[PDB]
Amino acid sequence: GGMLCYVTRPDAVLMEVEVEAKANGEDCLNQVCRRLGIIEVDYFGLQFTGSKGESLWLNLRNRISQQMDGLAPYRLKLRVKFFVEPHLILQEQTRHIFFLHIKEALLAGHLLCSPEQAVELSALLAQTKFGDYNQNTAKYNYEELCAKELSSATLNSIVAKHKELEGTSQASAEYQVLQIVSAMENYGIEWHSVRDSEGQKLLIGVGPEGISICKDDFSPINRIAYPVVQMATQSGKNVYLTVTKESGNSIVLLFKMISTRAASGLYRAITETHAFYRCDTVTSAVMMQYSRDLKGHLASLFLNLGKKYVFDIKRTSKEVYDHARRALYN
């Protein structure tokens, strides 16, 4: 009955969003964006946590009430779904929200960086929160982004770099954070917790370039691009990716997920990310998938001749007459 949604913004602020009882996910997010002054809505999504504690994206085309059936009070987290190059974001509020999202990922160690990267980033984050250097108010955060803190030895370089930023406006400092983070290898990569057969706890990253495979954010086993991935399917708690090897050999990768919703989430993450970054239009992405289905249906039609089409006759009426002529002459 004209249901209430508790939307958490990336600056930790809770919004009370009243939507129509049978409203879609797009209706929530649109009202959230209208109230935040966001025009570039298509970069955003609403994250929620399912029955099995798994983080899922709200489907903008379906009803909220169906998608979040059991789980009430309806709690949604406003998040950037599609990361693009910071300069390509035309509105300043949208840029600030990308920064809010990126700062949170950094301060939670969800994007680990080299000591050299962590020095400039720690100084830029200081300039953003407090402004130009002041001994009274100048707290830093080097430990969260990096592996270990080098104490005074590195703090002297971070206090040195924050001093070089004297004059850098809040917006500019934020833009540089976005610029540095957008250059990173794992920028715009969405990590999903899976199972390789029964053996290992693998982590799948869906990003603009393609699917990334690694065991708990370690050395990437395969940084597979999208043209290499032939097909993908979802069955229950499983995800069946059809990826082809350099020799033409189609090696079907298997992943086991915590739930059916989580398995759907990854399948949708592959289809959606590919279409967003690799297709001209949604129509084009719909076509590409359709074409791949017909193409594949015909590839199975020619994998299995005169056995089924057996005839008892050795000759036709014409052949009989000609064989009788030839037989007598020769």
Author numbering: -1 to 302, 307 to 332
Excerpt from the paper describing this PDB structure:
The second pathway involves the sterol-regulated inducible degrader of the LDLR (IDOL, also known as MYLIP), which is an E3 ubiquitin ligase that promotes the ubiquitylation and subsequent lysosomal degradation of the LDLR. Two distinct protein domains are present in IDOL: an N-terminal FERM (band 4.1/ezrin/radixin/moesin) and a C-terminal RING domain. In contrast to secreted PCSK9, which interacts with the LDLR extracellularly, IDOL is a 45-kDa cytoplasmic protein that interacts with the intracellular tail of the LDLR via its FERM domain. Here we present two crystal structures of the FERM domain of human IDOL.
The FERM344 protein crystallized in space group I4122, with unit-cell parameters a = b = 159.49 Å, c = 76.72 Å, α = β = γ = 90°, with one molecule in the asymmetric unit and a solvent content of 60%. The F1, F2, and F3 regions of FERM344 adopt the archetypical cloverleaf structure of the FERM domains. However, our structure shows that F3ab runs from 186 to 278 and that the region spanning residues 279–332 is clearly outside the cloverleaf region. Based on the obtained structure, we propose to redefine IDOL FERM boundaries as shown in Fig. 1A, with the extra region in FERM (which spans residues 279–344) divided into three subdomains to accentuate the extension away from the F3ab lobe: F3c′ (residues 279–300), F3c″ (residues 301–332), and F3c‴ (residues 333–344), with the latter not traceable in the electron density map. After the α7 helix, the FERM344 structure has a partially unstructured region from residue 301 until residue 317, followed by helix α8 (residues 318–332) (F3c″), which is the last residue traceable in the electron density map. Moreover, there are clear differences in the F3c′ region, where the FERM344 crystal structure has an α helix (α7), following the F3ab, which spans residues 279–300 and folds back onto the F3ab. The FERM344 domain packs as a tetramer in the crystal created by crystallographic symmetry operations. Its extended F3c′-F3c″ region (residues 279–332) interacts extensively with F1 and F3 of a symmetry-related molecule, burying a substantial surface area of 2537 Å2. In the FERM344 structure, the F3c′ is helical and positioned over the F3ab domain, obscuring the access to the peptide binding site. If this particular position is retained in full-length IDOL, it could prevent the interaction with the LDLR intracellular tail, suggesting a possible form of autoinhibition.
